[PDB]
Amino acid sequence: PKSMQCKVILLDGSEYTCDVEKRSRGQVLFDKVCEHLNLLEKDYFGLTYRDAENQKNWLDPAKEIKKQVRSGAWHFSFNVKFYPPDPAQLSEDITRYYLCLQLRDDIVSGRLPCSFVTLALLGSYTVQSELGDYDPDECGSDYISEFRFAPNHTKELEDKVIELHKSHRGMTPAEAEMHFLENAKKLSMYGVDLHHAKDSEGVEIMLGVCASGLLIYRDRLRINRFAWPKVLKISYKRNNFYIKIRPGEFEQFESTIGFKLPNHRAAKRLWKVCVEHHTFFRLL
Numbered sequence: 001p002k003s004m005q006c007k008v009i010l011l012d013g014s015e016y017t018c019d020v021e022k023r024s025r026g027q028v029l030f031d032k033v034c035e036h037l038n039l040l041e042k043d044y045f046g047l048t049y050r051d052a053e054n055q056k057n058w059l060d061p062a063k064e065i066k067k068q069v070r071s072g073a074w075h076f077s078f079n080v081k082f083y084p085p086d087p088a089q090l091s092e093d094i095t096r097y098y099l100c101l102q103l104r105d106d107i108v109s110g111r112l113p114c115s116f117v118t119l120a121l122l123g124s125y126t127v128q129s130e131l132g133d134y135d136p137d138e139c140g141s142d143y144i145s146e147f148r149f150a151p152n153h154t155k156e157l158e159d160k161v162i163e164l165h166k167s168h169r170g171m172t173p174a175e176a177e178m179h180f181l182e183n184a185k186k187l188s189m190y191g192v193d194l195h196h197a198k199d200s201e202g203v204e205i206m207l208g209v210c211a212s213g214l215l216i217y218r219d220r221l222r223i224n225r226f227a228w229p230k231v232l233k234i235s236y237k238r239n240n241f242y243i244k245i246r247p248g249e250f251e252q253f254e255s256t257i258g259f260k261l262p263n264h265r266a267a268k269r270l271w272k273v274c275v276e277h278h279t280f281f282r283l284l
């Protein structure tokens with residue numbers, strides 16, 4: 001029984017290595033990573049890989065690993081797939097912990113934009129969770145934390161993190177993690193997966209996929225939003241992605257919005273993430 005070595009980048013930046021039989025389905029490796037992580041609430045998470053077009057693909061747990069990674073290395077990342085709209089309702093603190101680690105990377109990467117004050121607040125809860133109570137001994141007037149808090153660090157941001165950290169004395173890690181999430185969950189780009197696209201006139205837009213529905217980011221004076229209820233049908237053909245939108249009450253026929261994606265694989269990838277979000281948030 002021939003086994004392939006898998007390398008998985010965990011959300012704390014460490015590497016987990018394991019072996020699976022070479023014809024294994026994605027679920028086999030995912031189960032192994034989740035067991036390693038002591039993670040029970042597995043539904044919110046998945047494994048990604050970087051392709052030959054160099055983009056992120058979700059590893060489909062139901063399909064053979066080799067038919068997905070094809071010519072590529074068996075190298076993966078562990079990631080949040082479905083961001084819970086209300087993390088307080090997750091049953092375990094360890095689930096909330098991994099969601100925090102993902103969101104910290106979302107913030108540092110600039111995928112999740114954040115005001116100065118919210119960067120400092122989120123940072124202050126991370127420090128409280130990781131170091132415990134503020135201690136002046138390992139913080140002078142010139143202190144800079146090892147923690148990455150933001151896409152661009154400033155001494156002002158470091159100072160504000162410390163000021164807010166002082167206010168959290170006696171907070172336990174699970175409590176600080178819950179505060180982090182109560183703030184993060186409100187950010188306008190929380191849990192939004194962004195895809196580059198062109199509208200039916202060739203104008204560059206972004207399409208956002210989230211729990212609630214679909215977002216079309218045009219010029220920022222115009223953001224169109226389609227709640228999952230309003231979306232009739234999702235489809236792709238060639239480099240095109242089509243959304244069928246319900247008629248308003250007393251209308252005879254749906255509207256179709258068409259988008260052009262960079263290539264056929266980018267269209268298929270958008271289609272599959274939308275179907276998965278539609279299913280997941282239909283059941284929540």
Ligand SMILES: NC(=O)CN1CCN(C(=O)c2ccco2)CC1
Nearest residue numbers: 210212213214215225226227228
């Ligand atoms: N007064 C309002 O209802 C404002 N509301 C419009 C739609 N909202 C969503 O639930 C959403 C996010 C993506 C698709 O739909 C966000 C903000």
